[PDB]
Write a protein that binds this DNA or RNA. Sequence first.
RNA 1: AUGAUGUCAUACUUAUCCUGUCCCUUUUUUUUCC
Lengths: 611, 85, 111, 66, 66, 183, 46, 260
Amino acid sequence: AEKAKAGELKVVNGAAASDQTPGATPKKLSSWDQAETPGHTPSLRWDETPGRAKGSETPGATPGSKIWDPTPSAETPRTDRGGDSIGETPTPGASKRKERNRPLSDEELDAMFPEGYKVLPPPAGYVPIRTPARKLTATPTPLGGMTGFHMQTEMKSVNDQPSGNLPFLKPDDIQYFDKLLVDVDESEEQKERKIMKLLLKIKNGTPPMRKAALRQITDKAREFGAGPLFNQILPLLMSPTLEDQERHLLVKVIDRILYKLDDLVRPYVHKILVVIEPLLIDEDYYARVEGREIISNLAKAAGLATMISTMRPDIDNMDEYVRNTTARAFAVVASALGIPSLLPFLKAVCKSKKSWQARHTGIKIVQQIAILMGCAILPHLRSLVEIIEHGLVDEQQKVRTISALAIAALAEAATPYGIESFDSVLKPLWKGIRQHRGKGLAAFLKAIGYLIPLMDAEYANYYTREVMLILIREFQSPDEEMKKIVLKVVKQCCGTDGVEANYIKTEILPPFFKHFWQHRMALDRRNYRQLVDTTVELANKVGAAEIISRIVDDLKDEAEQYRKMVMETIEKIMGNLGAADIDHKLEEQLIDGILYAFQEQTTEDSVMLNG
Amino acid sequence: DLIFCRKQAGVAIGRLCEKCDGKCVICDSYVRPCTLVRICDECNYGSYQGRCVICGGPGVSDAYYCKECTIQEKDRDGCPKIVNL
Amino acid sequence: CRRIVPGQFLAVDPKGRAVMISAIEKQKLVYILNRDAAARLTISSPLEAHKANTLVYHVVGVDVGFENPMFACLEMDYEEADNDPTGEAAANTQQTLTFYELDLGLNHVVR
Amino acid sequence: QSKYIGTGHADTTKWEWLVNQHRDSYCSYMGHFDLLNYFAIAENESKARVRFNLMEKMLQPCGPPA
Amino acid sequence: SSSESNRDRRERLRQLALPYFMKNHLGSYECKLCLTLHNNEGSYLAHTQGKKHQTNLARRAAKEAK
Amino acid sequence: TVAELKQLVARPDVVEMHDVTAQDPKLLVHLKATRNSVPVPRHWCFKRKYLQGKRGIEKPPFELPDFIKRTGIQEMREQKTMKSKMREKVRPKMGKIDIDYQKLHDAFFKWQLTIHGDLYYEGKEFETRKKPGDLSDELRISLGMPVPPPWLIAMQRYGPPPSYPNLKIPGLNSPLYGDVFGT
Amino acid sequence: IKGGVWRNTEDEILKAAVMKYGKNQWSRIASLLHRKSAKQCKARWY
Amino acid sequence: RGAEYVSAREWMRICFELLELLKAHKKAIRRATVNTFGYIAKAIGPHDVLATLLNNLKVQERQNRVCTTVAIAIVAETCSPFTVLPALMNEYRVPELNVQNGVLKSLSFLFEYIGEMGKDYIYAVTPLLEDALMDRDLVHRQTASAVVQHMSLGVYGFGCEDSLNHLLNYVWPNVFETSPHVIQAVMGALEGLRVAIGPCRMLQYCLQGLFHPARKVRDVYWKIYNSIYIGSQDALIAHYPRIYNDDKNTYIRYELDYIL
RNA sequence: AUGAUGUCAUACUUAUCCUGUCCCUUUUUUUUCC
Ligand SMILES: [Zn+2]
Ligand SMILES: [Zn+2]
Ligand SMILES: [Zn+2]
Ligand SMILES: [Zn+2]
């Protein structure tokens, strides 16, 4: 198989001929670890990645040399990104040598506007007026001019959308629906686009019109085909003025038509995802679950190789936005078609030697797979780790940070099992724990944090006792990311059965209530919750009267949200441990605290009452 | 859009919220609670601890199957925790 | 009594860690056993060995002391026989002996 | 339904349906101690050899397909 | 309940204005010429008050008169 | 061939028009004639969607089992102005039915179809179960014969009917009790 | 909300109602129809 | 709980006030409502209050009518339905259709709640189901079929199967339709009938439909045959008929022909 | 004597609905000073 190494030089030469893309090559070679298993499937997938034409040529020649050696013992798409980055280097470079307003060319001019329009000169002279216009925008604005009106007695054409009804058009949407306005009728495809304005009935109108329209377009899917639809939709779902509802509804029609169309969507897949991937990152939750759903339906609807070969060029894209949302995309498609099918792609990506941004993306993909799949990662956990491990030592920083973070997400979905799979990862991490300043440090603390519950109370005894020091020292950083991490950490480390009470009581609690309990935290949401939880667990170990006894005095504090916080904390605490531990005086302060806080209620909520 | 996950049935007890509390899952009925619900920790984990099998709120009780689904033996299939698609 | 439903063949580890139950075809399940805090027996959640279109002649526990448990499953595949109109796969098809390995840490059952 | 073996459909062939009911009959024979013992009585063999011949006939029965 | 009164009142009004319309063994109204079923007699009556129902009576008129 | 296919079956009558187009007639021939199995309903190849209201408009609304009729609830159930309805709320009277709990503990205990070889299809009601040899009561009354119907005296002379050749009617070749004088 | 397109059923029922009750009682005729008022019934007649 | 402290007149007024609480847009309201209506049904006794239920105009759809139906059920439980049925069965006579299908539902929920006790009343309901299952309009076949279902689960094992076979006759033609609610209804129906009657009779209705030339019949009878197949696959063995062996294949299972 | 095409219209179904819900979108050129 060393002739699969020199043979990797051969394949690199041939595929490089048919330049420089590392990914497809490592995808090709990625079938070697199964060796003697590899089969015709490698022709299918690669069929989409390069030209399906050369596909039969390369895969065929590969099986010949492979079987022989054993016995004796889209391109345009990527071509565009290269030119895009090269122009970026040209312009960026020029300023050093030295936006949307950059002058344009007639082919670029023919690129924007749709079919059926003519360019006009009226004169050569009026054109010379347009050329002097720049000079005369300064010159003739500094000259005599004015307007006036005379009193004289006085046809008025216009168009709404008439036929029978045609529910109303917003003043902007005309640009899209103008073709419907003209009343020319009854004389092929132009009549399918014309009748496809039933979209307008879905967008605006009465709810019944939306319903009936929606069905009518569902049953016409197979008829009209995906091309005309998406051609007439994606502009709308791309509209700058788009509503909330209208968005959601167009999402619905995209789903319902994608329950039917299967082989048809292959050309449009990317052309879909570009609009849809912004749904994954959103403030609305229901928008996110919808988005994940429709990308699931799309990826499963299309083919694996369709998705893969589609989505490569977005990995190295300059903007990180598309890289990120693209990572969540791979998460969704991987939930669709399963981890093992998509593994060799990834495992090829994280070893890409071109540039770091790729590896950063792929690692983020590992993470978002960890979040999405969650508990179900379990079988392939080992292979995944074996992928990610090589980034922890990389020279670039990001890759290290996001890497260890992805380990965190894994272990958190790995809740206790598979400890030895993380095994080889540890020894570097602990070492890094020493030497790091800034965010990466905190990230490591996140990872190690989720790890510790998965270790043995003996090994984790030592290792834990080591983590406690840095954990102490790092309470004081102003970083809120920091405080989140170290907070949840304190939960897991100090919520360990193998930790001694008195040590926490002395070393931890005083700084804990000092720095962590403040009015910066409580006003925030996540910090609020997580703080509640951590405090609850510390109570779960050191006991009740301590924690409560220290936080009672704050029931009487001015602000609400803070009072709400300590109130729900007391609630959960006395919920678990029981009130038996509480002494007398502190109980007087309790009841008085609870009445007092209850007597001033700015909002209506259960927390005070259930409390 | 809404369908069962049907992962293998474990020993974890089902948890229903306020809303779904009385419903037998499959028959949608309140009649004759008899046997008990089991779903996999793959479906029930973490933020899903004591989560509703349906809406996603905290479970205040445990779902009981009807006698109807009992004799038809449907309670023995994959874990009936509904997943949105 | 079913074709795909377990209970047919039954095996267990010498150390009693995990008991493996199996049907004749398609379904081989595993229950892991550990005594509680009081040393009273508690049973885990199931696992899945599922392998499509595979007949199981017999299943026998295997001895590995304090290891990831092993299981000896006699198997055969008829998928070769159904797609072979000639009848060659009726002969020239040998029953595959496979050892599954339970893995506690990874908590699944891999071939 | 699909992942439940024995599932039929409109295109189901004779051969597949009957080989199904065959194999299911054989799993019943492996299942019921008595009926098995009846077989051992009638044609004289061990319980073992009976079950063995059956397990041989699991994949074949009716022979090759069409 | 007010809704119940309308159902009663729109049956009687379609009884007054009313020889073809009837009520089946269920409650629905039917035109015995056209064999159509009507949700409400008035709604049914309009079909009964329509120009198609008219024709099919004439066609059956001729078809009997021959 | 639909011809020769009819030689391979014990009851080839089971083979029908579209049967010759079957993907596996060489079996379906052997199934459809299985001992106790029942035929497929006939409403398909009729495009009428299984029913119309022609014969269904002459049916009675319903009629109770005699066990429920003797009880006496039928007469109890049978009208009201609106203000009497709001008076029926303000006034209200109790115990209009006043059933006998002894009686409705009696009837369904003390006092209280088809076999498998039958299945219903669209238009079938009375006919199969008026036949040559079987008539209704009243028409007996118009005929006025005390307990053969007398034109089966002339079914002696002129011969057995062409229309129902299989015929037997009492006393001639059919060696009769109550109404039914021929089978 | 009440406003909308006129229906053959509403229109025929309007014929019968106008025949029975007479021209000057509109509120009585609007009572039988749904989703229509007395003014609309009168102006729809005339 | 107490229920004695208050005189009956007050109660029946409470009833006539409770009747329109069923316009609630919330499900829990109707919940408590129906259960209460059962309680006061115990406080008074059946006939009057079930008559007051049968007063209902049916005027709107769900949102709700069928809640009144549920009240008819629970009322029929609270004191023996052994009393109540004749009134209802008589009230199917009324020519108004939606209340006819209403009382059909009342039978459905009725058997669902009574369970075992239906070992008697099956007979009483049998001919009426005949009249209902014989189709005036689809909802009759549907709801009546649901009744056959819950009856079929309830009576299981007590030896009444005969009349259930008779009703299965009239059930059987409804197999064909594209309406989702009636087809899924019929599915539930034939499933309950599967467990009650036993598979053998089912399969004897499902044989010929498997291989029939048409696509429709095969689609459906194979759907049914699957429903019969998944459950009780163990008990089907005996009932597969004798199928002769062709050239390349031996279709006779000779094991069953070994004779001592 | 019920085929197809129509955005006419009305009934009807599903103990469906109407109160649940915010929790891992936190994404940037590493950068908090005895
Ligand atoms: Zn699951
Ligand atoms: Zn819920
Ligand atoms: Zn149920
Ligand atoms: Zn008509």
